TrEMBL record, chain B:
Mg(2+) 2 binds at D113, K114. One of its GO terms (biological process) is negative regulation of translation. Transmembrane segments: none annotated. GO terms for cellular component: cytosolic large ribosomal subunit. It comes from the Eukaryota. It comes from Candida albicans. Mg(2+) 1 binds at G86. This is Ribosomal protein L13. The keyword Zinc-finger does not apply.
UniProtKB/TrEMBL annotation, chain D:
One of its GO terms (molecular function) is metal ion binding. Mg(2+) 2 binds at A165. This is 60S ribosomal protein L7-A. Keywords: Metal-binding, Ribonucleoprotein, Ribosomal protein. GO terms for biological process: maturation of LSU-rRNA from tricistronic rRNA transcript (SSU-rRNA, 5.8S rRNA, LSU-rRNA). Mg(2+) 3 binds at N192. It comes from Candida albicans. Residues 33-83 form the Large ribosomal subunit protein uL30-like ferredoxin-like fold domain. GO terms for cellular component: cytosolic large ribosomal subunit. Mg(2+) 1 binds at F65. Belongs to the universal ribosomal protein uL30 family.
Automatic annotation (TrEMBL), chain E:
Mg(2+) 2 binds at K85. SUPFAM superfamilies: Translation proteins. It comes from the Eukaryota. Pfam families: Ribosomal_L35Ae (PF01247). Gene3D superfamilies: translation elongation factor selb, chain A, domain 4. Coiled coil: none annotated. It comes from Candida albicans (Yeast). GO terms for biological process: translation. PANTHER family: 60S RIBOSOMAL PROTEIN L35A (PTHR10902). This is 60S ribosomal protein L33-A. The keyword Metal-binding applies.
From TrEMBL, chain G:
Pfam families: Ribosomal_L18A. One of its GO terms (molecular function) is structural constituent of ribosome. The gene is RPL20B. Belongs to the eukaryotic ribosomal protein eL20 family. Residues 3-125 form the Large ribosomal subunit protein eL20 domain. One of its GO terms (cellular component) is ribosome. Mg(2+) binds at D108. PANTHER family: 60S RIBOSOMAL PROTEIN L18A. It comes from Candida albicans (Yeast). GO terms for biological process: translation. This is 60S ribosomal protein L20. Keywords: Metal-binding, Ribonucleoprotein, Ribosomal protein.
Amino acid sequence: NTLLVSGPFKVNGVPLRRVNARYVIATSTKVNVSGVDVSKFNVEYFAREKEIKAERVADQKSVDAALLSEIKKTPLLKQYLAASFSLKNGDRPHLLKF
Amino acid sequence: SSFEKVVVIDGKGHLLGRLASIVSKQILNGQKVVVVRCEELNISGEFFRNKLKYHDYLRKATRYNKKKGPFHFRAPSRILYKAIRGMIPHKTARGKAALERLKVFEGVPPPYDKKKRVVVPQALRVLRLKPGRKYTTVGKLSSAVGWKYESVVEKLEEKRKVQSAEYYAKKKALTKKLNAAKASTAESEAAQKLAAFGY
Amino acid sequence: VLKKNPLKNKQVLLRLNPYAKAYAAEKVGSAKVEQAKVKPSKGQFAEVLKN
Amino acid sequence: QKEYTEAERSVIKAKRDAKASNSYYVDAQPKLVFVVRIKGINKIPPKPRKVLQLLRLTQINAGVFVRLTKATSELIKLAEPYVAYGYPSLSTIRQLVYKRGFGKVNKQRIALSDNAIIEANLGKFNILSIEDLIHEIYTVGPNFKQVSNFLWPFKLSNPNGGFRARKFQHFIQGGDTGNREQFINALVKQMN
Amino acid sequence: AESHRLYVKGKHISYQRSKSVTNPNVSLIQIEGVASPKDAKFYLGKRIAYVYRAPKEIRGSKIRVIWGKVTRTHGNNGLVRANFKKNLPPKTFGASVRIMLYPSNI
Amino acid sequence: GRDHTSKQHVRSGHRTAPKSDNVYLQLLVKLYSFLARRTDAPFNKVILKSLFLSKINRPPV
Amino acid sequence: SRLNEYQVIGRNLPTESVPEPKLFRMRIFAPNTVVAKSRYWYFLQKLHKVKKASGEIVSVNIISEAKPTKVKTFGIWLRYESRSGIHNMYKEYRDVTRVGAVETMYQDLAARHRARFRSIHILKVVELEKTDDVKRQYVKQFLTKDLKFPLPHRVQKSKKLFQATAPTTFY
RNA sequence: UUGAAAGGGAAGGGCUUGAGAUCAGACUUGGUACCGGGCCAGCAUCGGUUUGGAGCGGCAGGAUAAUGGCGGAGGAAUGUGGCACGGCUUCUGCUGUGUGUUAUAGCCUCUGACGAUACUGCCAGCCUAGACCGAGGACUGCGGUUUUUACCUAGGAUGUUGGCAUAAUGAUCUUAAGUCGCCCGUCUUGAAACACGGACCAAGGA
RNA sequence: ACCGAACGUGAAGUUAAAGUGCCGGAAUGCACGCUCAUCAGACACCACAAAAGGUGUUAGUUCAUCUAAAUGAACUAGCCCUGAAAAUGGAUGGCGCUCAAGCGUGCUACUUAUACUUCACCGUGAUUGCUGUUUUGACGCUUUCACGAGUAGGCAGGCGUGGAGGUCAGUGACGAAGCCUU
Ligand SMILES: CN[C@@H]1[C@@H](O)[C@@H](O[C@@H]2[C@@H](O)[C@H](O[C@H]3O[C@H]([C@@H](C)O)[C@@H](O)[C@H](O)[C@H]3N)[C@@H](N)C[C@H]2N)OC[C@]1(C)O
């Protein structure tokens, strides 16, 4: 039931990991990931067994490659992904479009 | 309707009871309120009638010892305070805490002279009363029942208004300069892109 | 051990009323009615307007 | 289902034919009412109290089906300032029976959750299913007495949305009691 | 940046009550910027944290939390009813609470 | 609230067991309770209720 | 939205002596049909010596406005009961429907004469076709040439408790 | 006496939670590094109850809505253009009064064929947002899908994941806050009574 | 003692009467008017007011004089004013409120009782079944439904005390009984 996300790690510092759909805000911005190879990412990939296994680093590089390929097609999208989100004074989440 | 650190209200032209109920509910919910220019508050009805009402208030006093009786405060801010306290459960600890969130003043003393003052439309006299009705200014009523500092407040208010007009002239000059600067950098690429976004 | 509302539970509805399947499949709730366009009030009945 | 639709279309046709032939079609008077007690149990005079007991209306928001004749009309006349009643539609009867329908089996309130329960207690009167029971109520049939007495008094909730500002005066004067004649269905939708 | 907030500001207004009897199990919460029942329904089911400081450290921290959730709207002015694991103590009438953006349905 | 049509929580007013503490009378009651429960012969139910009766309700024959 | 206009038609129950009783119509301003038939029987019992038990309602029908978007002036004739007697009176109203003018009349007699709904009989509601049929000046002043007037002292209704700008009433 | 705590014209009490103190428990009488379990929680789906949405769609009725729009006939004035007379206009909404009937604006009444909308009701139509609850404990019943003595949402909650077990979790004591709470017993129609007995405690006491 | 509603111990929902400017949960909500009082008024029982006056204002009835530009007379009843004087200082509950937060009327939403609806648990009364499996509990076990206010009073089931018959081959100087104790 979880969601597979990536920063990309080179952009944000957040890697391939699972998140729960109830703890996420889905925006309007869309990136074409139709050419990203995410076939082999399953539950057992994030199975529990600090240092990161070399395979995980390699897959992070592999996915981030195509990700960064598509991201630069959208102007300012990369810098948008690099910046954190927060609620400013007067921001009403019930009135806001994401 | 945002939660503010302090809300500073210009009391000029507000009706006593309506402002009192709004401020009572504000302080009871944890909002700090300052009301300035209480001498400029309004009460509906002609001056003579409200003077009669205050004299009816004055008549009430503990018979066996006048020093225990109700204490009749004459200053305009204390008239507003009496109105507000009657709308608070002031004999509870929560009510005392709520009343500790309120400050009322004659005139506009520092540091509130250089802070933003707001109005309360639901309590404003010019918006609430029918145009032909008569009303009382609380400063005039206070003087008629024993408040001693009307002329002092008037003089200090004149001085403050001179200083504030000087402040505003400087602010207006800078604003005009900045507006000219913004208009000069118009028809720019960033400006056009912003205009496409509504800004 | 537990009463289940037939108006909410479809299985209980079909357990109590088998015809509910025919009613749904035949769209009885939104069935069209064939008839002709007529105005039978255009004569005397128009005394609804004034007497 | 066929005879309900045929009855509806024929009444529509007879009204439309009366307009053409310079006549007036008067609907058949209602044969059925649904009676809801909307008054509590305190301070009731003896005669309406007995009448309410005889209608099996012994709690607030209890509802029963009554076949209309002169005898029952005078009965309901006595209890008028303590009840709200009107003429139930087919869908109202179906919703009441489906959601809050209970049967009196050996002096016990039993949920009408299976057609076997209905058939073991009313089968001798040719009532074999919940739709037979609803039909027998709606079209006031030969065995209305047994079917309606087998039904436990319906135990409704208070209306979602409340009553009018004051209940205990007639519906005509802006209250909630007496005959409201098609608006009993809106009240039951609120309370069922 | 200068701001890091991911919650909506709120206040603990009152308990559910009649004129003379209060019900501590239900708290009435004022959500900042919410002024109608239409806008308040966005926050129904969202989690609420009351965060406070206590004299004695637990796991090295003096910060303690009482968790709740929004259950339904209250009235016509955008207040909501909330249900906390432990009833909010009445001294917090007027104190700030945190309305989370999750469980999210955006 | 309820507008009660009858008195609430009324015991039946019929004796459901012998007041006697005699063990052999209770053995007989056990036998005829089985018999009345498993046979639908009216005689056994009559005999069951009779075993419960007090002394003045069983005059000598 | 408070009221509708109905026609209610009724008669006596047919008997051997009178097999074809006369049909009587009334125009009733009521919230619903239950009240409409109740008013019909109330008036028939006051005028003729007929009770509800020996009669029957023949027809109940909505009478809709012919021109719901045409501005009209109505004359209304009334019988009402004060605290001290019974009086007749005639008033005038401007509206786009008969029901609107009747609702205004009910509000108006509530306001000026403390006359509740139960204390008023609507004798007649008439659309005044000519400017000479309009008698009262409080409606006649809205029928003059090139009528125009400002709306001074506009009070704007705010969505916030505190305003950061001075109040204004221009318009 | 010592220690802890509280305190603006009484104190005490109930309910609730916070804080401080105390007590308690499953890593079990755990099984052979793994298996498996206890507690608190997140999410998912189901069942029961229930509150919502600017909800979406189908159908029926009525004056087979009334209107409006279009076509046609008739009329009038708070009379448009035109024309005739004027006070202020180099007619620069200037302007008022007349006459009369669409003209360089329009309006009203009746009506002919279509087409909608409101209002009321039905749908065993669809989509969608929250809350509370999970009683029972092999099977047995009624139904459903039929692909089949199989499976199901159909005689009451399960799946999965994280954390913790030196702990969150619960209970009691003290205290603060919010809210409510007059002194018992008795005689009495009626007691908190400005009606009577009662300063306190032990033992005896019908 | 009135209105609502009658009460086992709880959860969720909805209400009754009464309310929604603040004290106080719920609208300074939508709407047509009336009223300005130098003792306004503000909600049943209920915490009073009369006869009688007003050219204050509002709406109505019936007559009359009018171009041979409107006006005059009598009258009806709404709110307001006068009639309306008591002793400690003080009560629309208080604050306070004037296109109201007053009076008459219509509407939309909303607030909350030990009441109503569904569910859990306790008790009472009834009710289903239970012997070749009844088997060492049949005064038991088990299925289902309804109900629960109470002085005087009746009855039932239990708790505690001194002493007596029987039993536990019961506890105890390695500490009985008593007493003190978050
Ligand atoms: C419509 N009926 C009215 C009834 O409402 C009431 O009227 C009072 C009137 O008496 C009051 O007036 C009276 O009473 C007040 C005071 C005692 O309140 C006195 O100051 C005043 O002098 C006196 N005339 C007036 N101020 C308000 C009306 N509604 O008194 C009876 C009545 C006159 O019949």
